[PDB]
Every structure is written in structure tokens, then in C-alpha cells.
Amino acid sequence: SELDQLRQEAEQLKNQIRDARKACADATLSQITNNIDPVGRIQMRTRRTLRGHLAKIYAMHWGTDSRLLVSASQDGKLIIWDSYTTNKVHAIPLRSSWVMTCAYAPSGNYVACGGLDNICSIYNLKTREGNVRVSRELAGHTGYLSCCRFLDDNQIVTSSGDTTCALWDIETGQQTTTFTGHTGDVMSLSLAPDTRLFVSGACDASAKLWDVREGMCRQTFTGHESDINAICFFPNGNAFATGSDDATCRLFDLRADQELMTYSHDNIICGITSVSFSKSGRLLLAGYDDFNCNVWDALKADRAGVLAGHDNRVSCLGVTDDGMAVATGSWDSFLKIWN
Amino acid sequence: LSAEDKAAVERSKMIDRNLREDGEKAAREVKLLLLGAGESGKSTIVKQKTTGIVETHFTFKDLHFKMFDVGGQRSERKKWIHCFEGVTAIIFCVALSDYDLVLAEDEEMNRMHESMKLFDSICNNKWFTDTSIILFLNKKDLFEEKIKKSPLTICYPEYAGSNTYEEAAAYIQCQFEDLNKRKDTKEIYTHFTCATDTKNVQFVFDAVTDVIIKNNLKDCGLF
Amino acid sequence: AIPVIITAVYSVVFVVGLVGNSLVMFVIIRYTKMKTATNIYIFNLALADALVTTTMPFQSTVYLMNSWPFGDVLCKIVISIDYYNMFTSIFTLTMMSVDRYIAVCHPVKALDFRTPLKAKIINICIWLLSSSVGISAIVLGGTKVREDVDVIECSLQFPDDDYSWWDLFMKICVFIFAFVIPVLIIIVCYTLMILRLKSVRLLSGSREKDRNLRRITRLVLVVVAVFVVCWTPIHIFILVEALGSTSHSTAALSSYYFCIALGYTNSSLNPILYAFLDENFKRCFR
Amino acid sequence: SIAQARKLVEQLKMEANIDRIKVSKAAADLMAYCEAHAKEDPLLTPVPASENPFR
């Protein structure tokens, strides 16, 4: 009866949490938004189409600046693009052809690579010998890695398939902390701009806030009803929007952890593969399985434009840190840059 | 323009040429999705530390097969099955001798029923509308004496036939073939083999050659 | 009365052939990717038909006026591009059938022998092979009069000399290497392709893959029929008026213009058939 | 097991006793951050040809 008593206590305390966050919502974001000037049509024509991939592209990541992004695809090649000149600087081979995550460090010296091989790959881009060489072979995850966003030059955060997030060290290869509490499988990871916290989404429609210095879940919230596979912070750091496989996008805040705004439309029934913000936070860019990309008013929850033009389903999009341009990757071995 | 920009353009063209000549052989490197139940004869098929997909590189008559054994992937299969659109065939190794025993440690479900559910899941995927399944039935040698004592009534109380080897193999064949819900674009190849039996490479070679004939009709514009 | 209808139908088929070939070239240039080995071949067919459809007003006006005010300025080029079209169409239909046969019967070596680079190499080789005949035609061109009506037509430059044996050897050689070796290769390759498709397991069922094989065989049969039945009576007419002697009979020229009408109708119907039948354009257009 | 239930109930108890303040102020400061940085965003207002180096 002790297990039943503990289950009842957890149920009533979660009910108390739900009642507290229900009474905490004095007003909704719609009735504060509805008296501002709307955003016009974002007729963003393509500028660069980074052709050269021979296989399906799953992930991309920018740097602190533009002009340099990394791209991951199942051809075993991790191409570092020169974005303005459409050129490519390095073509990194992979030991494993199964990749679905990649990242570009803020220092620009290390890149992430992982996938179904259950091993994170870190390569040193700047070496006295002229080549791209792997530095640390990060293993310890029994599931497939799915998101490998970088803290800094020495700390890497990996989202994995064993329903646990992990923070590693480059020089030792061991996990400093193991973030545990996600029941479902995890394929979302986004770090806060102040590099103090991060949120992660999992299959159980749960977005959990974690602290990196001590490693425990500070808040969680369930508003979705399907697999969450796209997460990103608001650029102010006090909110984060969630993209799931539910044909909807939802916005949560770090201060109340409630349903601020949902982004769902009748004409779209396909899932979202990636979601990212611009540096102002007014526009929310949501990828879709409808073979296109769609932008969203992050306050008015209206469609501000469609970046149609992909021959296949998109899988990754990233707006640059200076708000310059978005590079939407897709399954058709293309990577279109929009402005 | 500037000399550094011209050098960068030349390096980009050189590495594009290298990427083209390295990815042109990926079409010749044909690839197979090997999957099956645990200890169901999958370990002995591959003879003819990443803790993930095991890569085996082997060739027969200059074709360079690749097998992706997913035996060490304990995660949810639905979210990583979309990375195998480029696979040409599905190898499904299941054992015929695993019809009576349920787990050999607990009693809640037979191994054959879970294998049938896995085949129905992997055969009716929207990702595999036109990926021909090379079904394999192995370790028939242990099934020869295990059918003399135990009938099919342990596994199926709807058999009502003859408790013999050939009819048992044919009825397992009939259950597995009828799991396919669309027989027009999908064809399921089956081979009978043992743990010490050869001529599996011939069956898989014939399979891959037929699928690439279908591909060659498809790109030329006839199929 | 009599020339009113036939010239109108000729102009109509000329216009529809031009517009069909123009739309085929436009979609293969800017709407359908050109990477498949058969894409460059249907491109070659489009280009050859575009080069030969231009001579249709020339044929119409020479049928009308029974002569031409053209001189040696352009009869030489419109008689060189005739043989250029002939060799191009024949060798592309041969190499397309060879490519299909090596795709079906040898699929393990089709991945190596069906690279786009090798397709371009074979295409340039057959382009040069047609161009040798084209430059031979352009250096053995010219005109002369006939002393019954004093009209003019441009043909091979061979005066009254001991070159008649050479002219018959040239005509018999182009006949053999046009409708013996290429048609024999096309027929043998397609029959062996269907024979290999007998033994496969994904196209020899009973529900829909059997009728898929049936429509594929109907496709190759109708392609061979449209090529042969339309291009062959030309070869009967010219080979009949090569070995012996044939004057300008009224039944001869009527059959001559009938055969020319067929040999232009096939080139007009090739873009429409290869756009509504090749199924890659059907997949792209949807 | 029972240890998993103890861990979950303690983790949820830790998440229970956190500070929660009004959602309307979160909407207000989200709107304030959006309007205060709307000028510094080329995706909102398109920069001219001298700027916008994707040309």
C-alpha cells in the first residue's frame, strides 16, 4: 500500500501544481496582443541554395556570426559551408554514416556529429597539420544521439536515445552530469543564451528545464499530445517555443511554464521538424512536412508568409545570431537560405 | 576577384570533385536492412564497440552489400526508421523452432506472435511501400525434431491440419505472406535455411538483382 | 482543290510538331532534371526533330513550285542536316534500346555502364559518327538541271562517270547500317529484355505486375512499330530507285511525297508520344 | 519500483515549491522585448542593397 500511497501523493501534488499554474494565469497573451500593429507578408525569396549534398540532410547549425554553417547528411560527409560565396571550406568524413545531429561551436573550433551509432563525434577544425581530425570520441549513451548543442569550447550537451541528456568534457570524455527524468525518448535540445539553463523535449510531450551546474529538472510542463522534435528558446531567454509532431507549435515561458500561445492551422496536418526564432523574437519559423516552411507571428499566432520551394520535407532550419538569414535544410539534399 | 577568393573557389571545386567521386560509389555500394527478433538465428546469418548499428561489409559477384543490424538499438524504432528510405531490401531473420517456447524465463507472450507483430509493423510502414522483404526462416534443423513431439496447438489453436514438417513450414509461410497488405508493388522473398546451410548469398544476390532491375525500369521510365 | 487539303494538314502537323518539340525542350531544360541517361537521349531526339522540322516549309514550297529559289546557299545545309537527323535518330534509338537491355539483363554491370558521364561519352561518340556523314554530305553537295522541265534539286555530287558503282555501294552501305544492323540490334535487345523480364519475381505475378509487364512490352512494341513502319517505306523507295532505273512517274512522286509525309509525321509524333508515354514526364507533370 | 516512485514524488515536490508569478507580466515583457528589438531585425524590416550581403 506504500506504492499506492506514494502514487496518490504524487497525483494530488501534481494536481496542486496544476491548480497553482491555473490560478496563476490572470490573463492570456491574445487579449494583450490584439491591439498592436500586425506583421505584413514575409515575401522572403531564396538567396543561396547550398547544392552539393548527395543524400538526405537532417541537421544544421550556425556560428556566432553568419558565413559559416555546418551540415549533416547520411552520405558520411559533414560539409562546412561558406554561406555568402556558396562555397564549402571542409568536407569532414564520418566513421558512421548515420547522422541526425550536428552543431557548430561558438568558438568555431569544434563541431558535433552523432546519430544512430550512439557516439558523439567532436572534430578539431583548426590544426597545425592541414586536415580535419577527430579529437574526442564521446561514448556512454546506450541510445541514439539526436541533438548536440554546444555550451562552449570545452562543454558539450548531448540529447540521446536512452531518455537522458548529458553534459560532457572534451579532455576526459566522461559525463559530468546526467539529466534524468524524461520518460519518453528525447530528440530536442536548446541552450539558453546566457548559457546557464537548457530545455529539452521528449516523446511524452514534456519540456523540462534543467540547470547545468548541478543537474536536476527545475520545471516541467505538458501541453502537447504528440512527439516533440523541435525546441528553441525565445531570444530574451525567458520563454521557449515547442515544435512537435502534432501540426501545432506551442510557446512556453520560463517563469510560469504555461501555455502562452498555440500555433495551429486547419490547412496543415503535417508535423514540424524544426523551429527557431529570429533575434527579435517577433517571427517564429516553423518547418513542416508539407514540403515547405512557414513563418508565424510569435504574438499574433498568424501566418506571416510561406517559404515554399523545397522539393521534399524539411528537417532543420536556423536563423543566424544577428538575425540575418535562415537556412532551411530538407530531405532533398538542398539547403536554401532565405531573406 | 581576389587571389584568396579564387584559391577558396578552387579548393571548393576540388573537394566537390572528391565528394562526387566518393559518393558515386555509394550507388554501387548496395545496402540491406537486417533486422529480427533476439536470438532468432540473426547472429548466425551474418557469418555468410559502438553498441548501436553493427556494420558488416561483404560482397558477392561484385555487388558490395551492406547490412545494418539494429540489434543493439534499444530506443523507439518509429523515430529512426525514416533514415532507411535508401535501403534496397529488408532482411527478416526469424526462427521456425521458436513457435512453442514463449520466453524460456517467463510466460506472457510467445516469440512467434511478437515476430508476427514486428513483421506487420515493418511491412506496412509508409516508408517501405516499395522495399521488397527478403524474409528468412533459419535453424530448420532444430525444427525437425521439435515438431515430432509438440504440435502447432501450443502456438496456434486454429491449425487443424497435419502435424508434419512440410505442412508446418507451409502454414508459417502462409501466415507470413498474408501479413503483406499490398501484394502488387511489394514482393516478399522467402528462403529455407539452417544454421549450417549455404546458398543464402545466392538468394540475397538474386533478391538485390531483381530489386535493381525494378530500379532500372523505374529510372528509364517503364515500370 | 487537291493540294488545298494536303498542304493545310502538312502545315498543321508542322505547327503541332514545332510546338510539342518546343515544350518538350523547355520542360527538359528548366522543369525536369537532366541527369538520367535516357534524358540526354530524348534531348537528342528533340534536337534532331527540331533541326528537321525546319525543312518542312522547304519541302512544302518545293512540292508547290516544283523547284526552289534557294541556290547552293542553304540546300547544302538542308541536305546535310537530313542525313544528320537520320543517323542521329537511328543511332539514338539503337543506343536507347541497348541501354535498356543492359539495364535489364545485366543490372550488376548497369550501375557501372550507366553512369551519366559514360552516357555523355556514348552520346558524343554517336554525335561524331552522325557528323562524319553530315560533313561528307556537305562536301558532296550541289545542284544540277534536268533537261525535260529545267527544274533543280540538290542531291549527292556525282556526275556522269564511273562513280555509279560507288553510289550504289554508298546507298547499299547506308541501307545496311540503317535498317539491318540497328533494327536487328533493337529487336534482339528488346526481345531479350522481355525474355529476361519473364524470369523476374516482381513483374511475373498475377494481379498487377503481369499487366505492368504487358504495358511495358506494348510500349516497346509501339515504339518499334512507329519507328519502323514510318521510316522503312522511304528506304524501299530510295533503294528501288537506286539499283535499276526509275523515271519521274506520276505514281512514283505521289508515293514519294506520301513517304516524305510519313517520315515527317513520325518526327512530329515523337515528342508527343515521348511526353505522354515515357512516364517520367507523367510523374513530373502529375 | 518503489525507489522510482520515491524519486519521482521527490522530484515533483522539488518542482512544486518554486516561485510562480503572473503570466500577464510575462506576456507584457515578451511584447516589450519584441518591440524593443524590432528595429534590429532584418527579417522584419528588409535592409537595402548596400546592406543585406545575401545579394
Ligand SMILES: CC(C)[C@@H](CN1CC[C@@](C)(c2cccc(O)c2)[C@@H](C)C1)NC(=O)[C@H]1Cc2ccc(O)cc2CN1
Ligand atoms: C527524313 C525525311 C522526312 C526526309 C527529309 N528530307 C529533308 C530534305 C528535303 C526536304 C529536300 C532536300 C533537298 C531538296 C529537296 O527538294 C528536298 C527532302 C529530301 C526530305 N528524308 C529524305 O527524303 C532522305 C531519306 C533517305 C534515305 C536513305 C538514303 O540513302 C538517302 C535518303 C535521302 N533523303
